Amino acid sequence: HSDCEAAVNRMLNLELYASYTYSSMYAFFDRDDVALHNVAEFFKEHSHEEREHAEKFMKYQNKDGGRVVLQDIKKPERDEWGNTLEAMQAALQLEKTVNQALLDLHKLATDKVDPHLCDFLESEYLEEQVKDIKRIGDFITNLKRLGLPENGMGEYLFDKHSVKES
Amino acid sequence: HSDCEAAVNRMLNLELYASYTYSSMYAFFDRDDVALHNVAEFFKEHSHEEREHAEKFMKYQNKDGGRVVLQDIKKPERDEWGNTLEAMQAALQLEKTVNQALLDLHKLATDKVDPHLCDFLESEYLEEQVKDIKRIGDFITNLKRLGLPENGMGEYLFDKHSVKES
Amino acid sequence: HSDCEAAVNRMLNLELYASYTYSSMYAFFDRDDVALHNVAEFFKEHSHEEREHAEKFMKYQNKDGGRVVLQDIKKPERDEWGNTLEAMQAALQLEKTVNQALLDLHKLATDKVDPHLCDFLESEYLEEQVKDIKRIGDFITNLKRLGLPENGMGEYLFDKHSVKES
Amino acid sequence: HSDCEAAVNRMLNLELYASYTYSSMYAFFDRDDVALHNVAEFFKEHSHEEREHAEKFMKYQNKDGGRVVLQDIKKPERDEWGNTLEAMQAALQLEKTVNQALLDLHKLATDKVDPHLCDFLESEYLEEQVKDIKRIGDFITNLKRLGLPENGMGEYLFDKHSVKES
Amino acid sequence: HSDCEAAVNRMLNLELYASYTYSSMYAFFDRDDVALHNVAEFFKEHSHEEREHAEKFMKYQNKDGGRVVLQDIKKPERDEWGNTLEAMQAALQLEKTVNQALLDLHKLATDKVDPHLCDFLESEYLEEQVKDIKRIGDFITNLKRLGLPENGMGEYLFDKHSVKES
Amino acid sequence: HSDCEAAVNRMLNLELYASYTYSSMYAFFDRDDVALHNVAEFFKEHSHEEREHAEKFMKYQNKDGGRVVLQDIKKPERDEWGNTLEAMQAALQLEKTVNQALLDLHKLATDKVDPHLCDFLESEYLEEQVKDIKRIGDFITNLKRLGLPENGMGEYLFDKHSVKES
Ligand SMILES: [Cl-]
Ligand SMILES: [Cl-]
Ligand SMILES: [Cl-]
Ligand SMILES: [Cl-]
Ligand SMILES: [Cl-]
Ligand SMILES: [Cl-]
Ligand SMILES: [Cl-]
Ligand SMILES: [Cl-]
Ligand SMILES: [Cl-]
Ligand SMILES: [Cl-]
Ligand SMILES: [Cl-]
Ligand SMILES: [Cl-]
Ligand SMILES: [Cl-]
Ligand SMILES: [Cl-]
Ligand SMILES: [Cl-]
Ligand SMILES: [Cl-]
Ligand SMILES: [Cl-]
Ligand SMILES: [Cl-]
Ligand SMILES: [Cl-]
Ligand SMILES: [Cl-]
Ligand SMILES: [Cl-]
Ligand SMILES: [Cl-]
Ligand SMILES: [Cl-]
Ligand SMILES: [Cl-]
Ligand SMILES: [Cl-]
Ligand SMILES: [Cl-]
Ligand SMILES: [Cl-]
Ligand SMILES: [Cl-]
Ligand SMILES: [Cl-]
Ligand SMILES: [Cl-]
Ligand SMILES: [Cl-]
Ligand SMILES: [Cl-]
Ligand SMILES: [Cl-]
Ligand SMILES: [Cl-]
Ligand SMILES: [Cl-]
Ligand SMILES: [Cl-]
Ligand SMILES: [Cl-]
Ligand SMILES: [Cl-]
Ligand SMILES: [Cl-]
Ligand SMILES: [Cl-]
Ligand SMILES: [Cl-]
Ligand SMILES: [Cl-]
Ligand SMILES: [Cl-]
Ligand SMILES: [Cl-]
Ligand SMILES: [Mg+2]
Ligand SMILES: [Mg+2]
Ligand SMILES: [Mg+2]
Ligand SMILES: [Mg+2]
Ligand SMILES: [Mg+2]
Ligand SMILES: [Mg+2]
Ligand SMILES: [Mg+2]
Ligand SMILES: [Mg+2]
Ligand SMILES: [Mg+2]
Ligand SMILES: [Mg+2]
Ligand SMILES: [Mg+2]
Ligand SMILES: [Mg+2]
Ligand SMILES: [Mg+2]
Ligand SMILES: [Mg+2]
Ligand SMILES: [Mg+2]
Ligand SMILES: [Mg+2]
Ligand SMILES: [Mg+2]
Ligand SMILES: [Mg+2]
Ligand SMILES: [Mg+2]
Ligand SMILES: [Mg+2]
Ligand SMILES: [Mg+2]
Ligand SMILES: [Mg+2]
Ligand SMILES: [Mg+2]
Ligand SMILES: [Mg+2]
Ligand SMILES: [Mg+2]
Ligand SMILES: [Mg+2]
Ligand SMILES: [Mg+2]
Ligand SMILES: [Mg+2]
Ligand SMILES: [Mg+2]
Ligand SMILES: [Mg+2]
Ligand SMILES: [Mg+2]
Ligand SMILES: [Mg+2]
Ligand SMILES: [Mg+2]
Ligand SMILES: [Mg+2]
Ligand SMILES: [Mg+2]
Ligand SMILES: [Mg+2]
Ligand SMILES: [Mg+2]
Ligand SMILES: [Mg+2]
Ligand SMILES: [Mg+2]
Ligand SMILES: [Mg+2]
């Protein structure tokens, strides 16, 4: 019946949503008419990370004596992702949406005088999110430099050099 | 536009649904007023397996030249799972529901003369499912023998002996 | 002459009090007419942890340029602890009492604009306390399930399975 | 209801008292305006030893079929310890006070024809105490030789050479 | 154009200033008419630490999407440092000046509702600074005890025993 | 009061200036809208080298019986560096400026009949500088060949192939 308790359930749902969107990006880049497998695997890894982030909120809820209450995991906003630049731009926005949600949870915890929840967020979530935003930003800058979307050689090269070989 | 292609997308959605239900069972058994941690971890492992099973269907779809099309992952049917017997009975039914879906996909593949899809299902899915159904059945029999739901000592003992220590 | 300085001295005293209560629980479970040695050793380990927590506050005080000022360590509230359920219920309440004291120190540090002290508490104390509260809660639930206090077989079994073998 | 049983409880209380005094000496020497860290760590180790000596009496009481009965642990006689010479002189007196208590327990055990308790004391306590008294005596002689309290160079040197480096 | 962004640039400049002052202290103690090489190396290590602390703020600025803007690194306040006591007293004041700047940045971040920056400071800066202040304080106390500035034997001994051998 | 002594102090200041400029180039290439991390790390390494070169002059001054006298470290000439070609061209000019200063010091040492200083410069500085000038020259030629500044694919490729992976 707690506002933080409900907020955490919402946050867990959002992490699950983010994981599913990344999974969609993985599937797209794996397609035979897309076929950027390093880019695919980058998004697969991000999907697994976000699911791990959801499971951490489940654990926190239970340690906190709250109840985990699950809702539908909504499908991603798109069925196809265009190319590496468009997908990275959507990822950036997704990470920012998750970041603002985290920051909103932190403001709630602050108002509710819940320093344990403030620390949890600061220690387990906020800096990972700053890192992911920076790295995706950096990728977008490079994709622009490489001439996306028009420059297919540049897109091919990004897949080889910018993302780890899978 | 393929019937097998759509069927595979449906199957992938069902695997994701099954994974989410298991995740719910994990969260429940982790609760401070439930507190059967081996049972919790058993269901967590099943959730991870079902997600892996979804990802295999994504890979198959793409290798097949189909398109992965995602839908909402519906929340589990219950928010709380009663006890170890009730949760295992629900797991049994979930596994049977997934099994019948797999078998229905197999009948479709058979009609569509798709031996590759028939083999995929037979080699990667059907026997795992027979194993999971047997093991859950066996657990139910033991939980009954142990006096569930009334016998809380028996439920405690099941957690110690029947499921691997986490 | 600082309010945080005095508060820290009080907190150190409380940690020492908590350690002593745990030591009493250890001694009780070691008795020849109690004789639950795993349960005894669980409480002995908690006593050593709380003493370590007191010593950390001494170190903090000194690094902070404050003065460690000691008071009497009051004897535990009880001379005998009933059984494993009663002892765990008292431990739960003790952990909650220490937790509220920590949280009160944190509110003081927050008012006094002492982020270093806020971090200390958040990084070294608050999450350990959430863990201990969860684990004791979980034990109480299990002890209830096992039929305590009446079910001596259940109490025997708890000692074997729930607490680490000493 | 035993005289030896009560005597042991008193002895355990005294060991706990001695440990707490040593802990106070540790805290003092750690202070930023005292800052003799080897001397601090020497007294910290003595505090841990005395606590171990208390726990041995708890074990003995329980093996003996007696009951451990705890009382308040009184705060040390001083809040500040002067310097290394004054602290060592107080330690010497504390060790002698504990030694006389042990010897008094031994006389009681002798009167009560309790050779097991006599052996316990002789084998686990009396010789450790002779060693500690000798070593502190030896330190006092050296601190005098070094010109304490006036000779701060001598006090600095004692910390470097006489007590183990921490 | 951010107040935190400018504040971080100022903080980075101050860290660079602190590093340069330490470098000056290193050079002084290396002189043939000063010749306290352990003391020299202590200040050299502190200079390298402060430069590392500046580079961390550059990294933070960039991850934060701000711009690193550099200003002149002002020369140290003194060209010569007297002796080990005077140098340590100046170091103490320098560390306190850096600490107050950090704490002021933290107050700004708090007002601007920037918990990520609050955590950064608390996790990477504030406790290191408490440690450095304590250790220098402790050194000053010892240098006083050793008879500085008049007691050149004491100063020689400090170099041998208090600071690590280089 | 020596001309070589003052000259060395000037030289040390210039090395510190050069290190700071390189640090600025590092920060620029790390930016989210620049994002050439290998190029960033190349300039970071050059900054650390130049600081090491300053510290060597401090050591030389002191061994020589001179006094290290520090001045302000002036901020770099630019706040932003354009792109990899512009930054390399500025680095080339910076290295040449340091080289001419070294050569001027050498002429002074030669006039002052200071073969030890001549050797120092020849053995520790002049050949490193010839190497750095060659390597930066070579980079400029390649950046031109790659089509800088207009060819962003070429700039991306330079970062991958020409500078070591960080
Ligand atoms: Cl709400
Ligand atoms: Cl709330
Ligand atoms: Cl939701
Ligand atoms: Cl995680
Ligand atoms: Cl779409
Ligand atoms: Cl954001
Ligand atoms: Cl890149
Ligand atoms: Cl269909
Ligand atoms: Cl078909
Ligand atoms: Cl579906
Ligand atoms: Cl699988
Ligand atoms: Cl329900
Ligand atoms: Cl079935
Ligand atoms: Cl079984
Ligand atoms: Cl107060
Ligand atoms: Cl205060
Ligand atoms: Cl108190
Ligand atoms: Cl601890
Ligand atoms: Cl009682
Ligand atoms: Cl609480
Ligand atoms: Cl349990
Ligand atoms: Cl008596
Ligand atoms: Cl007796
Ligand atoms: Cl007593
Ligand atoms: Cl012992
Ligand atoms: Cl006193
Ligand atoms: Cl004696
Ligand atoms: Cl001695
Ligand atoms: Cl400002
Ligand atoms: Cl701001
Ligand atoms: Cl500035
Ligand atoms: Cl650092
Ligand atoms: Cl001066
Ligand atoms: Cl300060
Ligand atoms: Cl010596
Ligand atoms: Cl020595
Ligand atoms: Cl010292
Ligand atoms: Cl000149
Ligand atoms: Cl000259
Ligand atoms: Cl100059
Ligand atoms: Cl060098
Ligand atoms: Cl500029
Ligand atoms: Cl040149
Ligand atoms: Cl090249
Ligand atoms: Mg909470
Ligand atoms: Mg919808
Ligand atoms: Mg939100
Ligand atoms: Mg606040
Ligand atoms: Mg962190
Ligand atoms: Mg991440
Ligand atoms: Mg993220
Ligand atoms: Mg096919
Ligand atoms: Mg619904
Ligand atoms: Mg079906
Ligand atoms: Mg067949
Ligand atoms: Mg098979
Ligand atoms: Mg299976
Ligand atoms: Mg299954
Ligand atoms: Mg403080
Ligand atoms: Mg009382
Ligand atoms: Mg309180
Ligand atoms: Mg933590
Ligand atoms: Mg704990
Ligand atoms: Mg605790
Ligand atoms: Mg006896
Ligand atoms: Mg009193
Ligand atoms: Mg006595
Ligand atoms: Mg003996
Ligand atoms: Mg001893
Ligand atoms: Mg002793
Ligand atoms: Mg930020
Ligand atoms: Mg000036
Ligand atoms: Mg300031
Ligand atoms: Mg905070
Ligand atoms: Mg920390
Ligand atoms: Mg430090
Ligand atoms: Mg510092
Ligand atoms: Mg010379
Ligand atoms: Mg200027
Ligand atoms: Mg010149
Ligand atoms: Mg010549
Ligand atoms: Mg050479
Ligand atoms: Mg070089
Ligand atoms: Mg160079």
Domains belonging to chain F, first-starting first, are 1-166 (1.20.1260.10)
Q: Are A41 and A138 in contact (CB under 8 A)?
A: no
Q: Which two tokens stand for residue A104?
A: 């909103």
Determine whether the interchain pair B70/A79 forms a contact, defined as Cβ–Cβ distance below 8 Å.
yes
SS3 content of chain F, % helix, strand, coil (to 5): 75, 0, 25
Q: Which two tokens stand for residue F120?
A: 């120092």
Residue of A nearest to E115 (CA): A122
> Exposure of D123 by Cβ count < 10 A (0-12 exposed, 13-18 middle, 19+ buried)?
exposed
Is A145 at the interface with chain E, CB within 8 A?
A: no
Q: How many residues does chain F have?
A: 166
Determine whether the interchain pair C63/E122 forms a contact, defined as Cβ–Cβ distance below 8 Å.
no
Distance CA E109, CA E106 (A): 5
Q: Which two tokens stand for residue D155?
A: 């006090």
Residue that has been written with the tokens 């010892």 in this structure: E142
Residue that has been written with the tokens 């001994």 in this structure: E157
Is C71 at the interface with chain D, CB within 8 A?
A: yes
Instruction: Give, in order, the Cα–Cα distances in Å from C144 to each of B151, B156, C29, E82, E119.
Output: 12, 11, 19, 72, 41
Q: Are B162 and B142 in contact (CB under 8 A)?
A: yes
The alpha carbon dihedral of F132, F133, F139, F142 has a sign of: negative
DSSP 8-class letter at F2? -
Name, in order, each residue with C-beta under 8 angstroms of A101's C-beta and a sequence gap of 6 or more: A10, A11, A14
Distance CA F44, CA F50 (A): 10
Q: Which two tokens stand for residue B47?
A: 């959730």
Q: Which ligand is nearest to the CA of C24?
A: 19
Please provide residue E19's backbone torsions phi and psi, each rounded to the nearest 5 degrees.
Answer: -60, -40
Instruction: Give, in order, the Cα–Cα distances in Å from E164 to each of A86, E31, E130.
Output: 56, 19, 20
Residue that has been written with the tokens 């602890």 in this structure: C81
What is the phi-psi region of residue C39: left when phi exceeds 0, alpha when psi lies from -120 to 50, beta otherwise?
Answer: alpha
Residue type, A160: K
**Chain A neighbors (3+ CB pairs < 8 Å):** B, C, E, F
Q: Are A91 and A22 in contact (CB under 8 A)?
A: yes
Nearest by CB: E75 against F24, F65, F71: F71
**E64 contacts in A (CB within 8 Å)?**
130
Residue of E98, E122, E138 to mutate, interface with C, max C Cβ within 10 Å: E122
Residue of E61, E67, E119 to mutate, interface with A, max A Cβ within 10 Å: E119
Is D70 at the interface with chain C, CB within 8 A?
A: yes
DSSP, collapsed to helix, strand or coil, labels residue A147 as coil
The count of other CB atoms within 10 Å of the CB of residue A32 is: 10
Are E and C close enough to touch, i.e. 3+ CB pairs under 8 angstroms?
yes
Determine whether the interchain pair C62/E131 forms a contact, defined as Cβ–Cβ distance below 8 Å.
no
DSSP, collapsed to helix, strand or coil, labels residue B114 as coil
Distance of alpha carbon B37 from its chain centroid, rounded? Answer: 19
Q: How many residues does chain A have?
A: 166
Distance CA C77, CA E68 (A): 59
Is B27 at the interface with chain A, CB within 8 A?
A: yes
Nearest by CB: D72 against C32, C70, C75: C75
DSSP 8-class letter at A30? T
Distance CA C121, CA C141 (A): 29
Determine whether the interchain pair D23/C75 forms a contact, defined as Cβ–Cβ distance below 8 Å.
no
Q: Which two tokens stand for residue D26?
A: 């540790």
Is A119 at the interface with chain C, CB within 8 A?
A: yes
Q: Which two tokens stand for residue E4?
A: 């935190």
Distance of alpha carbon B1 from its chain centroid, rounded? Answer: 28
Q: Is A95 annotated as a binding residue?
A: yes
Q: How many residues does chain B have?
A: 166
The count of other CB atoms within 10 Å of the CB of residue F97 is: 13
Q: Are C120 and C60 in contact (CB under 8 A)?
A: yes
Instruction: Give, in order, the Cα–Cα distances in Å from A2 to each of A15, A112, C131.
Output: 20, 10, 20
Instruction: Choose among C94, C123, C128, C124: nearest CA to C16.
Output: C94
Distance CA A161, CA C163 (A): 52
The count of other CB atoms within 10 Å of the CB of residue B76 is: 19
Distance CA F44, CA F3 (A): 33
Tell me how many residue pairs between chain D and chain E have CB atoms under 8 A apart.
33
Instruction: Choose among E94, E48, E18: nearest CA to F55.
Output: E48
Q: Is F95 annotated as a binding residue?
A: yes
**F30 contacts in E (CB within 8 Å)?**
58-59, 62
For residues C146, C147, C149, C155, the Cα torsion angle rounded to the nearest 10 degrees is -30
Nearest by CB: E126 against C62, C65, C115: C115
Q: Are A161 and A102 in contact (CB under 8 A)?
A: no
Q: Which ligand is nearest to the CA of B36?
A: 21
**Chain E neighbors (3+ CB pairs < 8 Å):** A, C, D, F
- Asked if the bond preceding B115 is cis, omega within 30° of 0, the reply is no
Q: Are E155 and E148 in contact (CB under 8 A)?
A: yes
Q: Which two tokens stand for residue B132?
A: 């999971």
SS3 content of chain D, % helix, strand, coil (to 5): 75, 0, 25
* Helix B152-161 vs helix B84-111: crossing angle, to nearest 10: 50
Distance CA C60, CA C67 (A): 10
**C145 contacts in B (CB within 8 Å)?**
152-153, 155-156
- Experimental technique: X-ray
Is E123 at the interface with chain C, CB within 8 A?
A: yes
Instruction: Choose among B166, B76, B27: nearest CA to A62.
Output: B27
Indicate the resolution in Å.
Answer: 1.6
Determine whether the interchain pair C126/A115 forms a contact, defined as Cβ–Cβ distance below 8 Å.
yes
**E58 contacts in A (CB within 8 Å)?**
none
Helix or strand holding residue D4 (H, E): helix D3-29
Is E55 at the interface with chain A, CB within 8 A?
A: no
Determine whether the interchain pair F30/E71 forms a contact, defined as Cβ–Cβ distance below 8 Å.
no
- Return the ∠ at Cα A107 (arms to A106 and A109), rounded to 5°: 60
Min CA distance, A123 vs chain C (Å)?
Answer: 9
Instruction: Choose among C59, C11, C1: nearest CA to D30.
Output: C59
Q: Is A15 annotated as a binding residue?
A: yes
CA atoms within 13 A on the CB side of B143: 20
Distance CA B34, CA F36 (A): 53
Q: Which two tokens stand for residue A106?
A: 């932190």
Name, in order, each residue with C-beta under 8 angstroms of E11's C-beta and a sequence gap of 6 or more: E57, E101, E102, E105
Q: Are B121 and B102 in contact (CB under 8 A)?
A: yes
Distance of alpha carbon E73 from its chain centroid, rounded? Answer: 14
> Exposure of D116 by Cβ count < 10 A (0-12 exposed, 13-18 middle, 19+ buried)?
exposed
What is the phi-psi region of residue F134: left when phi exceeds 0, alpha when psi lies from -120 to 50, beta otherwise?
Answer: alpha
The count of other CB atoms within 10 Å of the CB of residue F3 is: 12
- Return the ∠ at Cα B7 (arms to B1 and B13), rounded to 5°: 115
DSSP, collapsed to helix, strand or coil, labels residue A42 as helix
Is A153 at the interface with chain C, CB within 8 A?
A: no
* Helix A127-145 vs helix F152-161: crossing angle, to nearest 10: 120
Residue type, E137: G
- Give start and end residues of each alpha helix (H) in C30-151: 37-63, 84-111, 115-121, 127-145
Min CA distance, E99 vs chain D (Å)?
Answer: 18
Determine whether the interchain pair A145/F155 forms a contact, defined as Cβ–Cβ distance below 8 Å.
yes
Is D96 at the interface with chain E, CB within 8 A?
A: no
For residues D92, D96, D102, D107, the Cα torsion angle rounded to the nearest 10 degrees is 160
> Exposure of B16 by Cβ count < 10 A (0-12 exposed, 13-18 middle, 19+ buried)?
buried
The count of other CB atoms within 10 Å of the CB of residue A120 is: 25
Please provide residue C89's backbone torsions phi and psi, each rounded to the nearest 5 degrees.
Answer: -65, -45
Distance D98 CA to ligand 27 centre (A): 8
Instruction: Give, in order, the Cα–Cα distances in Å from B165 to each of B88, B159, C153.
Output: 18, 8, 22
Is C69 at the interface with chain D, CB within 8 A?
A: yes
DSSP, collapsed to helix, strand or coil, labels residue E54 as helix
**D33 contacts in E (CB within 8 Å)?**
137, 141
- Return the ∠ at Cα A78 (arms to A72 and A84), rounded to 5°: 130
Distance E138 CA to ligand 81 centre (A): 54
**Chain D neighbors (3+ CB pairs < 8 Å):** C, E
Is B37 at the interface with chain C, CB within 8 A?
A: yes
Q: Is F49 annotated as a binding residue?
A: no
Distance of alpha carbon D47 from its chain centroid, rounded? Answer: 7
Min CA distance, C113 vs chain E (Å)?
Answer: 8
Q: Are E123 and C119 in contact (CB under 8 A)?
A: yes
Residue of E130, E138, E146, E160 to mutate, interface with D, max D Cβ within 10 Å: E138
